[PDB]
Amino acid sequence: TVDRYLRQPWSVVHGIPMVCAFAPNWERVDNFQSRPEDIVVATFPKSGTTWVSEIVDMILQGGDPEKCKRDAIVNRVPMLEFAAPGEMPTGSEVLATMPSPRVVKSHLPAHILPKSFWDNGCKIIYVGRNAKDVAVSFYHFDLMNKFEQHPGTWDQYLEAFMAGKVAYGSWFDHVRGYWERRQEHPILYLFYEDMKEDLRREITKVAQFLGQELTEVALDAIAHHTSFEAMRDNPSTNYSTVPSHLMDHGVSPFMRKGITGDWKNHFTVAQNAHFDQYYAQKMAGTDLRFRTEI
Ligand SMILES: Nc1ncnc2c1ncn2[C@@H]1O[C@H](COP(=O)(O)OS(=O)(=O)O)[C@@H](OP(=O)(O)O)[C@H]1O
Ligand SMILES: O=[N+]([O-])c1ccc(OS(=O)(=O)O)cc1
Ligand SMILES: O=[N+]([O-])c1ccc(O)cc1
Ligand SMILES: O=[N+]([O-])c1ccc(O)cc1
C-alpha cells in the first residue's frame, strides 16, 4: 500500500519540497499538539540528527546505554513529519502516546515547524553541518532510501541541492532560519564539525541546556557510546532494522562514513570551485559560519 508513494518526485508543502509519502494530510503537522517539555532535535537532513538524538536519549536515561538499547532510535525519537501511508502509523500519531519529556525529530525549516512548538517555548537542539558534506551524505542517502526520489547522477543531484530543490528545500535558508530564530526562542545551535572535534565538549553543552548534571563517568559513557564506530555497529542506531524495501543498506549504509571532509572525495575540482563561489554569495550577510575541515 505504501509502494505507490516510494521513489516518487517530491511533493511540496508550504512552498518546501517534501518527501512524497510524508506530504498527504499535512494538517496533522500544521496542527501538531506539542508540550512545553518537548525537546525538538531539528536539522537539515544528514547533519547529525541521529547522533544528537542518541546523545539526548542517553542523557535523559542517566547515561545508561542499556535503556537506549530498549528500542531502535526510529521509535525512541519519532520523526514528527514521518508517514508511510498504509504500512505504519504516522510519526505524529506515535508521538501522541509518548510520555513527557518527548524527544521529537524533524527536518522542517523553522518557518514551517508547527506553530505549537514556538508558542509552547519548546527547547530546540539544532544541528548544522557544512553544506558540502551534507550534499554528499544526502546524495548517498537518496540512493539507498526508497522514500526519496531517485537522485540520478551526482553532478545533477548537486545542482538540485544548490538550488534548494531537494527534500526540505534550501540548506542555506534552513541553517540561517534557525540561527536567526534563536533571538525569540530557546535554541541550542550545534555544529556537526564541533562534535567531531570534541564530542565530550558538545555532550556537556547538551546536558546543560537540558538542565541535567552529568557525572564524569556518565559523560565518558555517553561519549564512548556515541562514537561513529559505536553507532555504526549498534543495531538500535544504525537503522539496520528498517525493512530493506524502505532502505537498501547494501546501496549505502545509513552510518556511511561519519567524517568531516568526505566532500573532498566526491566534489570535482570544477564542482568545488563553483560551489564555493555560490556559497559565498548565499552566506553573505550572516555571521553564521561552517567549517569544511577540522
Ligand atoms: N556518531 C556519529 N559520529 C559521526 N557521524 C555520525 C554519527 N552518527 C551519524 N553520523 C553521520 O551523520 C549522517 C546522518 O545524518 P542524520 O542522522 O541527520 O540523517 S537523517 O537526516 O536523520 O537521515 C551520516 O553522515 P555520512 O556518513 O557523512 O553520510 C552519518 O554517518
Ligand atoms: O559548504 N560549506 O559549508 C562551506 C563552503 C565553503 C566555505 O569557505 S571556503 O573558504 O572554503 O570557500 C565554508 C563553508
Ligand atoms: O531523516 N529521515 O529519515 C529522512 C531525511 C530526509 C529525507 O528526504 C527523508 C527521510
Ligand atoms: O522507520 N522507518 O521505517 C524509516 C524511518 C525513516 C526513513 O527515512 C525511512 C524509514
mmCIF file with all atom_site columns, all heavy atoms in Angstrom, residues 24 32 50 75 87 93 113 127 129 157 167 173 185 193 218 220 239 277 281 294:
data_model
loop_
_atom_site.group_PDB
_atom_site.id
_atom_site.type_symbol
_atom_site.label_atom_id
_atom_site.label_alt_id
_atom_site.label_comp_id
_atom_site.label_asym_id
_atom_site.label_entity_id
_atom_site.label_seq_id
_atom_site.pdbx_PDB_ins_code
_atom_site.Cartn_x
_atom_site.Cartn_y
_atom_site.Cartn_z
_atom_site.occupancy
_atom_site.B_iso_or_equiv
_atom_site.pdbx_formal_charge
_atom_site.auth_seq_id
_atom_site.auth_comp_id
_atom_site.auth_asym_id
_atom_site.auth_atom_id
_atom_site.pdbx_PDB_model_num
ATOM 1   N N   . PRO A 1 24  ? 0.896  13.926 2.118  1.00 0.00 ? 24  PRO A N   1
ATOM 2   C CA  . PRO A 1 24  ? -0.562 13.831 2.334  1.00 0.00 ? 24  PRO A CA  1
ATOM 3   C C   . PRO A 1 24  ? -0.957 14.107 3.772  1.00 0.00 ? 24  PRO A C   1
ATOM 4   O O   . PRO A 1 24  ? -0.308 13.647 4.709  1.00 0.00 ? 24  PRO A O   1
ATOM 5   C CB  . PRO A 1 24  ? -0.897 12.381 1.960  1.00 0.00 ? 24  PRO A CB  1
ATOM 6   C CG  . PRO A 1 24  ? 0.158  12.004 0.927  1.00 0.00 ? 24  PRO A CG  1
ATOM 7   C CD  . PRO A 1 24  ? 1.420  12.695 1.480  1.00 0.00 ? 24  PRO A CD  1
ATOM 8   N N   . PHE A 1 32  ? 0.001  19.994 14.881 1.00 0.00 ? 32  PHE A N   1
ATOM 9   C CA  . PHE A 1 32  ? 0.547  19.077 15.865 1.00 0.00 ? 32  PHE A CA  1
ATOM 10  C C   . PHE A 1 32  ? 0.468  19.719 17.246 1.00 0.00 ? 32  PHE A C   1
ATOM 11  O O   . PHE A 1 32  ? 0.755  20.917 17.394 1.00 0.00 ? 32  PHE A O   1
ATOM 12  C CB  . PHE A 1 32  ? 2.015  18.741 15.557 1.00 0.00 ? 32  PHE A CB  1
ATOM 13  C CG  . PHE A 1 32  ? 2.623  17.787 16.534 1.00 0.00 ? 32  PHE A CG  1
ATOM 14  C CD1 . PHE A 1 32  ? 2.368  16.449 16.474 1.00 0.00 ? 32  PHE A CD1 1
ATOM 15  C CD2 . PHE A 1 32  ? 3.464  18.247 17.557 1.00 0.00 ? 32  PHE A CD2 1
ATOM 16  C CE1 . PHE A 1 32  ? 2.923  15.571 17.379 1.00 0.00 ? 32  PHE A CE1 1
ATOM 17  C CE2 . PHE A 1 32  ? 4.016  17.351 18.451 1.00 0.00 ? 32  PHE A CE2 1
ATOM 18  C CZ  . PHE A 1 32  ? 3.756  16.031 18.372 1.00 0.00 ? 32  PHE A CZ  1
ATOM 19  N N   . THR A 1 50  ? 20.618 11.863 14.048 1.00 0.00 ? 50  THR A N   1
ATOM 20  C CA  . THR A 1 50  ? 20.662 10.620 14.807 1.00 0.00 ? 50  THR A CA  1
ATOM 21  C C   . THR A 1 50  ? 21.699 10.700 15.916 1.00 0.00 ? 50  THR A C   1
ATOM 22  O O   . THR A 1 50  ? 21.480 10.201 17.031 1.00 0.00 ? 50  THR A O   1
ATOM 23  C CB  . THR A 1 50  ? 20.981 9.472  13.846 1.00 0.00 ? 50  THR A CB  1
ATOM 24  O OG1 . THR A 1 50  ? 20.113 9.588  12.717 1.00 0.00 ? 50  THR A OG1 1
ATOM 25  C CG2 . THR A 1 50  ? 20.779 8.132  14.512 1.00 0.00 ? 50  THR A CG2 1
ATOM 26  N N   . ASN A 1 75  ? 12.076 4.574  16.758 1.00 0.00 ? 75  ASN A N   1
ATOM 27  C CA  . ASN A 1 75  ? 10.933 4.583  17.651 1.00 0.00 ? 75  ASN A CA  1
ATOM 28  C C   . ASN A 1 75  ? 11.179 5.372  18.923 1.00 0.00 ? 75  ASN A C   1
ATOM 29  O O   . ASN A 1 75  ? 10.227 5.932  19.475 1.00 0.00 ? 75  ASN A O   1
ATOM 30  C CB  . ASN A 1 75  ? 10.526 3.157  18.011 1.00 0.00 ? 75  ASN A CB  1
ATOM 31  C CG  . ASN A 1 75  ? 10.279 2.306  16.788 1.00 0.00 ? 75  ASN A CG  1
ATOM 32  O OD1 . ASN A 1 75  ? 10.890 1.254  16.617 1.00 0.00 ? 75  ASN A OD1 1
ATOM 33  N ND2 . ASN A 1 75  ? 9.390  2.773  15.917 1.00 0.00 ? 75  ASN A ND2 1
ATOM 34  N N   . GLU A 1 87  ? 1.162  1.451  5.710  1.00 0.00 ? 87  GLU A N   1
ATOM 35  C CA  . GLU A 1 87  ? 2.093  0.483  6.256  1.00 0.00 ? 87  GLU A CA  1
ATOM 36  C C   . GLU A 1 87  ? 2.419  0.714  7.728  1.00 0.00 ? 87  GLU A C   1
ATOM 37  O O   . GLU A 1 87  ? 2.702  -0.257 8.439  1.00 0.00 ? 87  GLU A O   1
ATOM 38  C CB  . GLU A 1 87  ? 3.388  0.481  5.425  1.00 0.00 ? 87  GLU A CB  1
ATOM 39  C CG  . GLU A 1 87  ? 4.627  0.014  6.159  1.00 0.00 ? 87  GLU A CG  1
ATOM 40  C CD  . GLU A 1 87  ? 5.553  -0.865 5.335  1.00 0.00 ? 87  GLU A CD  1
ATOM 41  O OE1 . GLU A 1 87  ? 5.506  -0.803 4.087  1.00 0.00 ? 87  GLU A OE1 1
ATOM 42  O OE2 . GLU A 1 87  ? 6.352  -1.606 5.951  1.00 0.00 ? 87  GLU A OE2 1
ATOM 43  N N   . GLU A 1 93  ? 1.138  10.550 15.012 1.00 0.00 ? 93  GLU A N   1
ATOM 44  C CA  . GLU A 1 93  ? 0.336  9.603  15.802 1.00 0.00 ? 93  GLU A CA  1
ATOM 45  C C   . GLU A 1 93  ? 1.166  8.914  16.879 1.00 0.00 ? 93  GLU A C   1
ATOM 46  O O   . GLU A 1 93  ? 0.742  8.822  18.037 1.00 0.00 ? 93  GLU A O   1
ATOM 47  C CB  . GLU A 1 93  ? -0.329 8.576  14.866 1.00 0.00 ? 93  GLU A CB  1
ATOM 48  C CG  . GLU A 1 93  ? -1.353 9.194  13.938 1.00 0.00 ? 93  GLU A CG  1
ATOM 49  C CD  . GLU A 1 93  ? -1.817 8.232  12.817 1.00 0.00 ? 93  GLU A CD  1
ATOM 50  O OE1 . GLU A 1 93  ? -1.262 7.110  12.692 1.00 0.00 ? 93  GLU A OE1 1
ATOM 51  O OE2 . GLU A 1 93  ? -2.708 8.631  12.036 1.00 0.00 ? 93  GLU A OE2 1
ATOM 52  N N   . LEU A 1 113 ? 7.995  24.790 10.893 1.00 0.00 ? 113 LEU A N   1
ATOM 53  C CA  . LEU A 1 113 ? 7.880  23.981 12.079 1.00 0.00 ? 113 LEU A CA  1
ATOM 54  C C   . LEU A 1 113 ? 6.557  24.337 12.758 1.00 0.00 ? 113 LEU A C   1
ATOM 55  O O   . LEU A 1 113 ? 6.209  25.508 12.816 1.00 0.00 ? 113 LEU A O   1
ATOM 56  C CB  . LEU A 1 113 ? 9.063  24.253 13.039 1.00 0.00 ? 113 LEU A CB  1
ATOM 57  C CG  . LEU A 1 113 ? 9.165  23.272 14.208 1.00 0.00 ? 113 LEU A CG  1
ATOM 58  C CD1 . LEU A 1 113 ? 9.675  21.875 13.805 1.00 0.00 ? 113 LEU A CD1 1
ATOM 59  C CD2 . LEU A 1 113 ? 10.104 23.925 15.244 1.00 0.00 ? 113 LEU A CD2 1
ATOM 60  N N   . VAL A 1 127 ? 21.124 21.162 14.789 1.00 0.00 ? 127 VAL A N   1
ATOM 61  C CA  . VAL A 1 127 ? 22.480 20.793 14.390 1.00 0.00 ? 127 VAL A CA  1
ATOM 62  C C   . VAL A 1 127 ? 22.675 21.221 12.957 1.00 0.00 ? 127 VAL A C   1
ATOM 63  O O   . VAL A 1 127 ? 21.901 20.808 12.090 1.00 0.00 ? 127 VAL A O   1
ATOM 64  C CB  . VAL A 1 127 ? 22.743 19.281 14.499 1.00 0.00 ? 127 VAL A CB  1
ATOM 65  C CG1 . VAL A 1 127 ? 24.254 19.032 14.538 1.00 0.00 ? 127 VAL A CG1 1
ATOM 66  C CG2 . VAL A 1 127 ? 22.057 18.688 15.722 1.00 0.00 ? 127 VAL A CG2 1
ATOM 67  N N   . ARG A 1 129 ? 25.679 21.390 9.680  1.00 0.00 ? 129 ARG A N   1
ATOM 68  C CA  . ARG A 1 129 ? 26.844 20.675 9.176  1.00 0.00 ? 129 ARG A CA  1
ATOM 69  C C   . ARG A 1 129 ? 27.227 21.364 7.870  1.00 0.00 ? 129 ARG A C   1
ATOM 70  O O   . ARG A 1 129 ? 26.364 21.914 7.190  1.00 0.00 ? 129 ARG A O   1
ATOM 71  C CB  . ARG A 1 129 ? 26.503 19.169 8.964  1.00 0.00 ? 129 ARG A CB  1
ATOM 72  C CG  . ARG A 1 129 ? 27.677 18.312 8.470  1.00 0.00 ? 129 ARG A CG  1
ATOM 73  C CD  . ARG A 1 129 ? 27.213 16.853 8.275  1.00 0.00 ? 129 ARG A CD  1
ATOM 74  N NE  . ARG A 1 129 ? 28.366 15.988 7.972  1.00 0.00 ? 129 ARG A NE  1
ATOM 75  C CZ  . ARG A 1 129 ? 28.260 14.705 7.652  1.00 0.00 ? 129 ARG A CZ  1
ATOM 76  N NH1 . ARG A 1 129 ? 27.076 14.140 7.465  1.00 0.00 ? 129 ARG A NH1 1
ATOM 77  N NH2 . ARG A 1 129 ? 29.370 13.969 7.515  1.00 0.00 ? 129 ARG A NH2 1
ATOM 78  N N   . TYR A 1 157 ? 22.403 15.853 -9.139 1.00 0.00 ? 157 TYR A N   1
ATOM 79  C CA  . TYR A 1 157 ? 21.912 15.998 -7.767 1.00 0.00 ? 157 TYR A CA  1
ATOM 80  C C   . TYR A 1 157 ? 22.489 17.243 -7.123 1.00 0.00 ? 157 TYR A C   1
ATOM 81  O O   . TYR A 1 157 ? 21.764 18.009 -6.488 1.00 0.00 ? 157 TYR A O   1
ATOM 82  C CB  . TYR A 1 157 ? 22.273 14.776 -6.932 1.00 0.00 ? 157 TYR A CB  1
ATOM 83  C CG  . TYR A 1 157 ? 21.790 14.968 -5.508 1.00 0.00 ? 157 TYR A CG  1
ATOM 84  C CD1 . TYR A 1 157 ? 20.442 14.717 -5.179 1.00 0.00 ? 157 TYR A CD1 1
ATOM 85  C CD2 . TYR A 1 157 ? 22.632 15.453 -4.541 1.00 0.00 ? 157 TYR A CD2 1
ATOM 86  C CE1 . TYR A 1 157 ? 19.944 14.943 -3.859 1.00 0.00 ? 157 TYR A CE1 1
ATOM 87  C CE2 . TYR A 1 157 ? 22.170 15.703 -3.222 1.00 0.00 ? 157 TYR A CE2 1
ATOM 88  C CZ  . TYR A 1 157 ? 20.821 15.440 -2.900 1.00 0.00 ? 157 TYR A CZ  1
ATOM 89  O OH  . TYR A 1 157 ? 20.325 15.642 -1.629 1.00 0.00 ? 157 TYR A OH  1
ATOM 90  N N   . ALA A 1 167 ? 14.451 17.474 -1.057 1.00 0.00 ? 167 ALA A N   1
ATOM 91  C CA  . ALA A 1 167 ? 13.508 17.376 0.045  1.00 0.00 ? 167 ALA A CA  1
ATOM 92  C C   . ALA A 1 167 ? 13.977 18.280 1.171  1.00 0.00 ? 167 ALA A C   1
ATOM 93  O O   . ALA A 1 167 ? 15.158 18.239 1.551  1.00 0.00 ? 167 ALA A O   1
ATOM 94  C CB  . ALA A 1 167 ? 13.416 15.935 0.549  1.00 0.00 ? 167 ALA A CB  1
ATOM 95  N N   . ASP A 1 173 ? 18.777 28.518 3.463  1.00 0.00 ? 173 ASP A N   1
ATOM 96  C CA  . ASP A 1 173 ? 17.646 29.055 4.205  1.00 0.00 ? 173 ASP A CA  1
ATOM 97  C C   . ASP A 1 173 ? 17.450 28.296 5.514  1.00 0.00 ? 173 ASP A C   1
ATOM 98  O O   . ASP A 1 173 ? 17.122 28.902 6.540  1.00 0.00 ? 173 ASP A O   1
ATOM 99  C CB  . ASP A 1 173 ? 16.355 28.995 3.358  1.00 0.00 ? 173 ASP A CB  1
ATOM 100 C CG  . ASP A 1 173 ? 16.368 29.937 2.186  1.00 0.00 ? 173 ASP A CG  1
ATOM 101 O OD1 . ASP A 1 173 ? 17.314 30.758 2.041  1.00 0.00 ? 173 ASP A OD1 1
ATOM 102 O OD2 . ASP A 1 173 ? 15.440 29.816 1.361  1.00 0.00 ? 173 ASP A OD2 1
ATOM 103 N N   . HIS A 1 185 ? 13.559 32.515 20.846 1.00 0.00 ? 185 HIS A N   1
ATOM 104 C CA  . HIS A 1 185 ? 13.161 31.173 21.237 1.00 0.00 ? 185 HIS A CA  1
ATOM 105 C C   . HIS A 1 185 ? 14.353 30.427 21.825 1.00 0.00 ? 185 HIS A C   1
ATOM 106 O O   . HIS A 1 185 ? 15.472 30.621 21.353 1.00 0.00 ? 185 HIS A O   1
ATOM 107 C CB  . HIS A 1 185 ? 12.641 30.415 20.014 1.00 0.00 ? 185 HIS A CB  1
ATOM 108 C CG  . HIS A 1 185 ? 11.897 29.192 20.364 1.00 0.00 ? 185 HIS A CG  1
ATOM 109 N ND1 . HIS A 1 185 ? 10.559 29.207 20.704 1.00 0.00 ? 185 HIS A ND1 1
ATOM 110 C CD2 . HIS A 1 185 ? 12.317 27.921 20.533 1.00 0.00 ? 185 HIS A CD2 1
ATOM 111 C CE1 . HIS A 1 185 ? 10.183 27.988 21.022 1.00 0.00 ? 185 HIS A CE1 1
ATOM 112 N NE2 . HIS A 1 185 ? 11.225 27.181 20.901 1.00 0.00 ? 185 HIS A NE2 1
ATOM 113 N N   . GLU A 1 193 ? 30.648 19.576 12.976 1.00 0.00 ? 193 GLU A N   1
ATOM 114 C CA  . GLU A 1 193 ? 32.107 19.597 12.969 1.00 0.00 ? 193 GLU A CA  1
ATOM 115 C C   . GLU A 1 193 ? 32.658 19.801 14.377 1.00 0.00 ? 193 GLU A C   1
ATOM 116 O O   . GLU A 1 193 ? 33.742 19.282 14.699 1.00 0.00 ? 193 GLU A O   1
ATOM 117 C CB  . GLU A 1 193 ? 32.610 20.689 12.048 1.00 0.00 ? 193 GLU A CB  1
ATOM 118 C CG  . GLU A 1 193 ? 32.400 20.370 10.549 1.00 0.00 ? 193 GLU A CG  1
ATOM 119 C CD  . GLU A 1 193 ? 30.941 20.533 10.109 1.00 0.00 ? 193 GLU A CD  1
ATOM 120 O OE1 . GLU A 1 193 ? 30.120 21.162 10.843 1.00 0.00 ? 193 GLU A OE1 1
ATOM 121 O OE2 . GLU A 1 193 ? 30.616 20.031 9.017  1.00 0.00 ? 193 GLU A OE2 1
ATOM 122 N N   . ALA A 1 218 ? 29.326 9.229  33.719 1.00 0.00 ? 218 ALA A N   1
ATOM 123 C CA  . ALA A 1 218 ? 28.244 9.233  32.739 1.00 0.00 ? 218 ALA A CA  1
ATOM 124 C C   . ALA A 1 218 ? 28.652 9.963  31.457 1.00 0.00 ? 218 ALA A C   1
ATOM 125 O O   . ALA A 1 218 ? 28.291 9.532  30.357 1.00 0.00 ? 218 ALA A O   1
ATOM 126 C CB  . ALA A 1 218 ? 26.984 9.854  33.339 1.00 0.00 ? 218 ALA A CB  1
ATOM 127 N N   . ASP A 1 220 ? 31.702 10.148 30.156 1.00 0.00 ? 220 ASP A N   1
ATOM 128 C CA  . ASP A 1 220 ? 32.548 9.248  29.379 1.00 0.00 ? 220 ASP A CA  1
ATOM 129 C C   . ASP A 1 220 ? 31.738 8.102  28.792 1.00 0.00 ? 220 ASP A C   1
ATOM 130 O O   . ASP A 1 220 ? 31.981 7.697  27.652 1.00 0.00 ? 220 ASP A O   1
ATOM 131 C CB  . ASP A 1 220 ? 33.702 8.722  30.234 1.00 0.00 ? 220 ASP A CB  1
ATOM 132 C CG  . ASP A 1 220 ? 34.729 9.805  30.560 1.00 0.00 ? 220 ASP A CG  1
ATOM 133 O OD1 . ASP A 1 220 ? 34.872 10.795 29.784 1.00 0.00 ? 220 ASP A OD1 1
ATOM 134 O OD2 . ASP A 1 220 ? 35.393 9.662  31.604 1.00 0.00 ? 220 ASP A OD2 1
ATOM 135 N N   . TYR A 1 239 ? 20.087 1.895  11.918 1.00 0.00 ? 239 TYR A N   1
ATOM 136 C CA  . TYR A 1 239 ? 18.947 1.786  11.020 1.00 0.00 ? 239 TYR A CA  1
ATOM 137 C C   . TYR A 1 239 ? 18.891 0.447  10.290 1.00 0.00 ? 239 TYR A C   1
ATOM 138 O O   . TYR A 1 239 ? 18.078 0.290  9.393  1.00 0.00 ? 239 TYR A O   1
ATOM 139 C CB  . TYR A 1 239 ? 18.894 2.918  9.977  1.00 0.00 ? 239 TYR A CB  1
ATOM 140 C CG  . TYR A 1 239 ? 18.273 4.182  10.517 1.00 0.00 ? 239 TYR A CG  1
ATOM 141 C CD1 . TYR A 1 239 ? 18.907 4.931  11.508 1.00 0.00 ? 239 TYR A CD1 1
ATOM 142 C CD2 . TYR A 1 239 ? 17.011 4.578  10.107 1.00 0.00 ? 239 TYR A CD2 1
ATOM 143 C CE1 . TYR A 1 239 ? 18.322 6.081  12.024 1.00 0.00 ? 239 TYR A CE1 1
ATOM 144 C CE2 . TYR A 1 239 ? 16.422 5.709  10.609 1.00 0.00 ? 239 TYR A CE2 1
ATOM 145 C CZ  . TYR A 1 239 ? 17.072 6.457  11.576 1.00 0.00 ? 239 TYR A CZ  1
ATOM 146 O OH  . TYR A 1 239 ? 16.463 7.578  12.081 1.00 0.00 ? 239 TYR A OH  1
ATOM 147 N N   . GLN A 1 277 ? 32.042 29.466 -4.748 1.00 0.00 ? 277 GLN A N   1
ATOM 148 C CA  . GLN A 1 277 ? 31.650 30.801 -5.201 1.00 0.00 ? 277 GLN A CA  1
ATOM 149 C C   . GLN A 1 277 ? 30.178 31.083 -4.906 1.00 0.00 ? 277 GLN A C   1
ATOM 150 O O   . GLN A 1 277 ? 29.828 32.181 -4.435 1.00 0.00 ? 277 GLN A O   1
ATOM 151 C CB  . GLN A 1 277 ? 31.964 30.948 -6.693 1.00 0.00 ? 277 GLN A CB  1
ATOM 152 C CG  . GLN A 1 277 ? 31.546 32.252 -7.317 1.00 0.00 ? 277 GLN A CG  1
ATOM 153 C CD  . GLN A 1 277 ? 32.092 32.408 -8.741 1.00 0.00 ? 277 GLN A CD  1
ATOM 154 O OE1 . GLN A 1 277 ? 32.747 31.501 -9.274 1.00 0.00 ? 277 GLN A OE1 1
ATOM 155 N NE2 . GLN A 1 277 ? 31.823 33.561 -9.357 1.00 0.00 ? 277 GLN A NE2 1
ATOM 156 N N   . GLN A 1 281 ? 28.288 33.768 -2.006 1.00 0.00 ? 281 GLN A N   1
ATOM 157 C CA  . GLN A 1 281 ? 27.188 34.662 -2.358 1.00 0.00 ? 281 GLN A CA  1
ATOM 158 C C   . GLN A 1 281 ? 25.999 34.464 -1.424 1.00 0.00 ? 281 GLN A C   1
ATOM 159 O O   . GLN A 1 281 ? 25.456 35.429 -0.866 1.00 0.00 ? 281 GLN A O   1
ATOM 160 C CB  . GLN A 1 281 ? 26.779 34.420 -3.815 1.00 0.00 ? 281 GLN A CB  1
ATOM 161 C CG  . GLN A 1 281 ? 25.374 34.897 -4.143 1.00 0.00 ? 281 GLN A CG  1
ATOM 162 C CD  . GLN A 1 281 ? 24.959 34.547 -5.574 1.00 0.00 ? 281 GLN A CD  1
ATOM 163 O OE1 . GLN A 1 281 ? 25.812 34.345 -6.451 1.00 0.00 ? 281 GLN A OE1 1
ATOM 164 N NE2 . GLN A 1 281 ? 23.645 34.496 -5.816 1.00 0.00 ? 281 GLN A NE2 1
ATOM 165 N N   . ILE A 1 294 ? 38.514 20.110 9.855  1.00 0.00 ? 294 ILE A N   1
ATOM 166 C CA  . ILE A 1 294 ? 38.865 20.414 11.251 1.00 0.00 ? 294 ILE A CA  1
ATOM 167 C C   . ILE A 1 294 ? 40.280 19.921 11.535 1.00 0.00 ? 294 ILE A C   1
ATOM 168 O O   . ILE A 1 294 ? 40.753 19.041 10.818 1.00 0.00 ? 294 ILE A O   1
ATOM 169 C CB  . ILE A 1 294 ? 37.852 19.797 12.230 1.00 0.00 ? 294 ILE A CB  1
ATOM 170 C CG1 . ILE A 1 294 ? 37.582 18.341 11.909 1.00 0.00 ? 294 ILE A CG1 1
ATOM 171 C CG2 . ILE A 1 294 ? 36.517 20.539 12.189 1.00 0.00 ? 294 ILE A CG2 1
ATOM 172 C CD1 . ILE A 1 294 ? 37.296 17.537 13.161 1.00 0.00 ? 294 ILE A CD1 1
#
